[PDB]
Amino acid sequence: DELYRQSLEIISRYLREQATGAKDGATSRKALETLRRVGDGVQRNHETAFQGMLRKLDIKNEDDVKSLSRVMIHVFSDGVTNWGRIVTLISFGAFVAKHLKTINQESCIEPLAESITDVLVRTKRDWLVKQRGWDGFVEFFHV
């Protein structure tokens, strides 16, 4: 599954660098750049709401992603799919990834990243392909 692999790589690298706080094909790099610009912006603009959501969710640990999965599934339960919701999901994923680091230094952000990727790729695979995948993602948020 190439789409899954690419998605997991992109999403993982963003969450990891957001969590640790530092940065270490072409499409993947452009997507990560777009994700950095839009995703950081979403986190800054909606920190209060994100904080509240996080507090209410009360995530204990890195492996505690089941509630998050239910939330991502429910987001699309109205039958609406768009890039805006997708990037906001990933943004919140990074916000959560940071907090886990607050709770402990050594958390693997992988379970969180894979949790997000599974919902996107499994449930919206044909939507993603129709939208031109991550190339479509980059184009949509272009400035």
């Binding site: 979403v42 509240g52 959501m53 939330v71 429910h74 987001v75 990037v87 919140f92």
Partner: peptide, 23 residues
């Protein structure tokens, strides 16, 4: 419920962003 509330927030912020970039 926290999950539903989270979903609605993400749905609201997502749609805001989508409308914004939709040109």
């Amino acid at each position: 419920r926290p999950e539903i509330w989270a979903a609605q927030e993400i749905r609201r912020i997502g749609d805001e962003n989508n409308a914004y970039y939709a040109r």
